Amino acid sequence: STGSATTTPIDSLDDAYITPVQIGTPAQTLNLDFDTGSSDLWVFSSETTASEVDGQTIYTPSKSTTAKLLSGATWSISYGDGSSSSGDVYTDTVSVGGLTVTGQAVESAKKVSSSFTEDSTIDGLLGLAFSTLNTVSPTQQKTFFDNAKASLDSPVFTADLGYHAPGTYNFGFIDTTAYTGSITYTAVSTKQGFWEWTSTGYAVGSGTFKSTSIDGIADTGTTLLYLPATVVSAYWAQVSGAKSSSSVGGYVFPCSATLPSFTFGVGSARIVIPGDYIDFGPISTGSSSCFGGIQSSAGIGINIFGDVALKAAFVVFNGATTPTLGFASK
Ligand SMILES: c1cc2c(cc1CNC1CCCC1)OCO2
């Protein structure tokens, strides 16, 4: 089997991407944030504290003939930005782009933090990291991909995120029309539960390539590219007026600037992130200070190849017995 679904930026900055997901019988379609950096499929629901719901579409298990309470199961998760959610668990039928999993754990939110309440466009998250990170207790649950894998034509999914435009998540096949050149594959460590890999280096603009190992995670659920302070300083040093602002919370730059590209290595291959991709616009409405799309990972504990990086590539998440990651230009 295979599945194919369009993923759409939630706003003009590509702050995140939402993908329609069918849950239950008859189908209830919710727009979820596919997150390769976590392993819980959770949704706004009829159980979510009413004051914490603000425009989202909710899952109502009592209206689904295939929903079953997973008795005794609870979940609670915190993300890298300090956001959080928690609740109880149902199993139900979940379909993405024509690919159906029965008995998928659908984690129903009773509580969500303010940042989720404030994102009216995100009805929940669909985790695509390794199931070892799933937070359901006392019986850990499998991701949608993990449940689907054995039935897929090939045990893979691909992320093809657009810049200021829709893109595609495919399950079970590689669309050879969706990228240019060849796909370069690179080793993955699953020891921390992430799609963790080592980049072979970087370049800033037309500058020479610096060969250096950068260990990080491929995370579709993180907006920006978070890299070591040395690398990030080298990038922003090429932008007149750019500076790290503690009050704003990262590098900012004059909105009048033309940003250089940033290249990252994947083995001997190179993925080029155009300068425009690194512009996250005014820090506040009407400001001439703009927020940078490449930021230091120093306060995070891990480097993160988030959407800014991934949207410059066609990315293969290969879930074979020994997982790997593939990157192609497009
Ligand atoms: C918070 C934490 C997350 C997440 C999504 C959220 C929701 N607010 C984000 C801010 C920009 C838009 C989405 O996906 C993984 O970790």
Residue given tokens 């009805």 in the structure block? 123
Residue given tokens 């993160």 in the structure block? 304
- Alpha-carbon 213 to chain mean position: 22
Residue given tokens 């609870």 in the structure block? 74
Q: How far is the CA of 221 from the centre of ligand 1 (A)?
A: 7
Shared domain check, 311 and 234: yes
Pocket test for ligand 1, best of 83, 118, 217 (most atoms within 8 A of CB): 83
How many structural domains are present in the chain? 2
**Cα–Cα distance between 300 and 307 in angstroms, integer?**
17
**Cα–Cα distance between 10 and 7 in angstroms, integer?**
9
Q: How far is the CA of 104 from the centre of ligand 1 (A)?
A: 22
Residue given tokens 């006392």 in the structure block? 138
Domain that holds residue 167: 5-174
Shared domain check, 153 and 15: yes
**Cα–Cα distance between 159 and 220 in angstroms, integer?**
8
Phi-psi region of 312 (alpha: psi -120 to 50; beta: other; left: phi over 0): alpha
Q: Is 279 a catalytic residue?
A: no
| Catalytic residue (choose from 38, 85, 86, 199) | 199
Of the three residues 120, 139, 174, the one that is the final residue of a domain is 174
Q: What is the CB < 6 Å shell around ligand 1? A: 15-16, 33, 35, 79, 81, 83, 115-116, 119, 122, 125, 221, 223
| Catalytic residue (choose from 14, 33, 35, 146) | 35
Shared domain check, 21 and 123: yes
CATH (domain of 297) = 2.40.70.10
The residue whose C-alpha atom lies closest to atom 14 belonging to ligand 1 is 221
Ligand 1 atom with minimal separation from the 219 CA: 15
Residues belonging to the chain: 330
Q: Is 35 a catalytic residue?
A: yes
Which residues, including other chains, have CB under 8 Å from residue 221's CB and lie 6 or more apart? 16, 33, 34, 35, 36, 37, 38, 79, 125, 306
Method of determination is: X-ray
Of the three residues 124, 149, 174, the one that is the final residue of a domain is 174
